């Protein structure tokens, strides 16, 4: 007859969300308290990741309803506050600044701070950038909104690859489709131990340091035609940027308290030179073209470009971190033309007091780096927003970096967390031995 027969370990799963786990690479070369993403208790990963490919299975994906990108954005915020918890407060620095110019984008400001002794007062000088200071005869930019905790010079903001790994009893489903939606069914899915190397960069309008595509450029949104959500244009090839801060800055240590040392910018030496980035001209020229082909597939007419209309300074420019210093690059040279080594040069302005995530609270002061600064941007994606209601003859794609979950959705689009239900009931012709 047909009697039940329960099987333990059936390969069936359900769409359910759980909490992930950091697992960095076997690179414990610390030698200093560093790696604000890994911190002190992110475990080493598997040296041999057990990537397991499946067949005869088509599971639907939804990278905008993914809960991994909500959990990633909560951790990076949590790591940002946790690393700044023991760092030096800038409470006594919120005094009236006496600022005189150098010529420029730097003012020398002389202020009053208490020493380690609670009664003595010293007057010291410090180079402060122009957008770090609001007029009052000057003050810092947001001392009258919230407190400022400067970044500890020991730690580093270089994003190491961290693998978010589901606990035992769960799984992560990786889609292997070369040209894939974003949201929709995937013909080639593969369960993995956990994810690939993900660099938790912070960047607006330009997805730096990520994964590339294999076949061609994929344009991704919720449904594209809606103007309210940003469009993630995941590149195939990577253009080359050589960003720099080509002026010599000296780090000056200012005594503000017992153990609390305020590292400001000392006397500038050499040439007063602007920070610039070389985003080729030839690789970008072919890049926008190949972007045009994918954007013209989803439309029927010409597709133009235009720089960002407005907002805060951190979205109208191209923000990122370049060796512990936060840049703000003017990306008007990239997107101006109306589409259907002689390098282009981006004027980037440096800010130290940065209020990342725009959460009311800690806004860190990045200490200056001694000497020249050079980094290597790489671009594996773009962040574009469609324009409003116009005629059908052309459409405008303003660049824009919205909520930071759009950065993580460029790397967590492949993955999906499901729970494993190994109990399963299925009828068979077997019956156990009867009692009587």
């Amino acid at each position: 007859d047909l009697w039940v027969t329960v099987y333990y370990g059936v390969p069936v799963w359900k769409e359910a969300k759980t909490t992930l786990f950091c697992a960095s690479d076997a690179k414990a070369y610390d030698k200093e308290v560093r790696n604000v993403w890994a911190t002190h208790a992110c475990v080493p990963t598997d040296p041999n990741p057990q990537e397991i490919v499946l067949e005869n299975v088509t599971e639907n994906f939804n990278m905008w309803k993914n809960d991994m990108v909500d959990q990633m954005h909560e951790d990076i915020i949590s790591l940002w506050d946790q690393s700044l918890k023991p760092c030096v407060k800038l409470t006594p620095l919120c005094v009236t600044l006496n600022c005189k110019n150098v010529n420029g984008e730097i003012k020398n400001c002389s202020f009053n701070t208490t020493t380690e002794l609670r009664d003595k007062k010293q007057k010291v000088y410090a180079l402060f950038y122009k957008p770090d200071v609001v007029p009052l005869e000057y003050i810092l930019i947001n001392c009258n909104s919230s407190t400022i905790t400067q970044a500890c010079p020991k730690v580093s903001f270089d994003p190491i690859p961290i693998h978010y790994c589901a606990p035992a009893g769960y799984a992560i489903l990786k889609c292997n489709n070369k040209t894939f939606n974003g949201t929709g069914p995937c013909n080639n899915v593969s369960t993995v131990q956990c994810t690939h190397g993900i660099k938790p960069v912070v960047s607006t309008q330009l997805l730096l340091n990520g994964s590339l595509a294999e076949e061609e450029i994929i344009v991704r949104s919720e449904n594209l035609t809606n103007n309210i959500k940003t469009i993630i244009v995941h590149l195939n090839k990577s253009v080359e940027i050589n960003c720099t801060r080509p002026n010599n800055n000296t780090r000056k240590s200012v005594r503000i308290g017992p153990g609390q040392w305020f590292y400001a910018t000392g006397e500038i030496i050499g040439d007063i030179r602007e920070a610039h980035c070389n985003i080729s001209r030839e690789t970008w020229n072919s890049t926008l073209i190949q972007v045009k082909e994918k954007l013209r597939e989803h439309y029927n007419k010409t597709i133009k470009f235009e720089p960002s209309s407005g907002g805060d300074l951190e979205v109208t420019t191209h923000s990122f971190n370049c060796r512990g210093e936060f840049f703000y690059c003017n990306t008007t040279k990239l997107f101006n033309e109306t589409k259907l080594n002689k390098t282009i040069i981006l004027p980037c302005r440096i800010k130290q007091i940065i209020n990342m995530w725009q959460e009311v609270g800690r806004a860190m002061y990045a200490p200056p780096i001694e000497g020249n600064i050079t980094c290597k941007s790489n671009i594996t994606g773009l962040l574009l927003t469609w324009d409003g209601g116009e005629n059908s003859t052309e459409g405008v794609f303003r660049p824009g970096g919205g909520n930071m979950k759009d950065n993580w959705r460029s790397e967590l689009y492949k993955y999906k967390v499901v729970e494993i239900k190994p109990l399963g009931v299925a009828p068979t012709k077997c019956k156990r031995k009867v009692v009587g």
Partner: antibody
Amino acid sequence: QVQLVQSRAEVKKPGASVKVSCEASGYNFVDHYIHWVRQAPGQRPQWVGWMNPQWGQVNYARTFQGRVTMTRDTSIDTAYMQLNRLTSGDTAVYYCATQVKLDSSAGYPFDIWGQGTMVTV
Amino acid sequence: ALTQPRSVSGSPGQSVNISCTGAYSGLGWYQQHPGRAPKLIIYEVNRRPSGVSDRFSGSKSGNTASLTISGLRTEDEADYFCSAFEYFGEGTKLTVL
């Protein structure tokens, strides 16, 4: 609770600038986008643009590009919209719109609207 | 390119029924009471938001949005707007005899 309250109605001369504010209370002001939409008294309602209060990230229709600037004051939960180069054809009632109490994450349509600000130039 | 008629007839007990054609037509419908801001009555052509009566409903087609209200009252006299993303319709005024 969870409402949008606008400023008083204004009548201005051509060429002058007007500022239509829209304060928000009772809900997460930052997390929800603030749309601005017109309605002329005797014409179809015309959509101006949207503005999310995280960084501002303003988006404009081409018929208002270069004339309207939307700023914000997130410390007091206020969303602004300032029109420059006002003309005779810029008469309507100006509504601030958002989407809070809906289960659709697509951002359209709107459900919660302001009290209204009739602007006649 | 979102068009709708201006006035359709009706009577208490007889359904008032509005067409609205266009690309992605009838994502949302608004009932603008005369004097104040409009109010959402249906979103995603057929789904019903909270705070509105059960008699408010809509039906979908290939390109035309059909808003059907059954059991009219005297207090429902308002202007009806058909919306599609950022676009909007012309506007339909209720007629109750």
